[PDB]
């Protein structure tokens, strides 16, 4: 879909350009294919580019838009993912603390040693904290 939308620019001029941008924006929203479209995992090394990024530019504003929406829906994980791309490190941890915090209180029998919110917790800490950590103490 991205490849096709990109053709829209082929008609060079404003209007069409915005139409292209809106179309991409519309694609990201509601398709919710964030990783594919927007990018993924830092391991330092900024984003690993999404397909759109290869095309480039307005990508930060789209992320904020998507992320806020995620907040409405309460699609946590998506929000965390989105904020990572946003590079709002402090925001990420805070949302993150909330996610891990609940699920901690509850009743027992869980927590395999390999994947979920806890695992997510481990990822971020190892990941951010060593590196020039921008988050609040």
């Amino acid at each position: 879909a991205l490849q096709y939308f990109y053709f829209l620019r082929d008609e060079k001029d404003s209007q069409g350009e915005n139409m292209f941008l809106r179309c991409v924006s519309e694609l990201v929203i509601e398709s919710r294919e964030f990783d594919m479209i927007l990018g993924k995992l830092e391991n330092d090394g900024s984003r690993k580019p999404g397909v759109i990024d290869k095309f480039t530019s307005d990508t930060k504003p789209i992320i904020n838009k998507v992320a806020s929406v995620a907040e409405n829906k309460g699609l946590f994980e998506e929000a965390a993912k989105l904020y990572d791309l946003a590079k709002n490190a402090d925001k990420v941890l805070e949302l993150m603390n909330k996610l891990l915090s609940p699920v901690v209180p509850q009743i027992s029998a869980p927590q395999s040693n390999k994947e979920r919110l806890k695992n997510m917790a481990l990822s971020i800490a190892e990941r951010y904290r060593a590196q020039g950590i921008s988050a609040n103490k």
Partner: protein, 118 residues
């Protein structure tokens, strides 16, 4: 915990079955409260959540959580009794009166519907 809400849920079922209330207007209110209660109990969760809970029960390896399933079971029992009675009342009602109150009763029927699906 919406335990306190549970009691209202019971009262609502009681009134509906009784079908007192000249006003369908009253019953529309009952339907609305019931609808929210049914919706509220299961915050949007899907089969994945249920599977995870079952595994944890797995078996009580240690201390499990099976809180939401237990809550759903209690709701469904209450509802059953009252249920046969009230189903009759809710459907007939349906039709008429209240094309209005309708918006409320059909929504109540659908929520209820998931749960007590089966």
């Amino acid at each position: 915990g919406d335990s306190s809400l549970y009691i209202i849920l019971k009262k609502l079922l009681d009134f509906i079955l009784k079908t007192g209330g000249g006003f369908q207007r009253v019953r529309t209110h009952l339907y609305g409260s019931l609808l929210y209660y049914l919706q509220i109990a299961q915050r949007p969760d899907e089969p994945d959540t249920l599977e995870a809970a079952k595994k944890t029960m797995w078996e009580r390896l240690t201390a499990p959580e099976d809180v939401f399933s237990k809550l759903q079971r209690e709701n469904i029992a209450i509802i059953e009794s009252y249920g046969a009675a009230l189903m009759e009342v809710v459907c007939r009602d349906a039709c008429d009166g209240h094309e209005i109150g309708r918006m409320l009763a059909l929504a109540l029927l659908d929520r209820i519907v998931s749960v007590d699906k089966q």
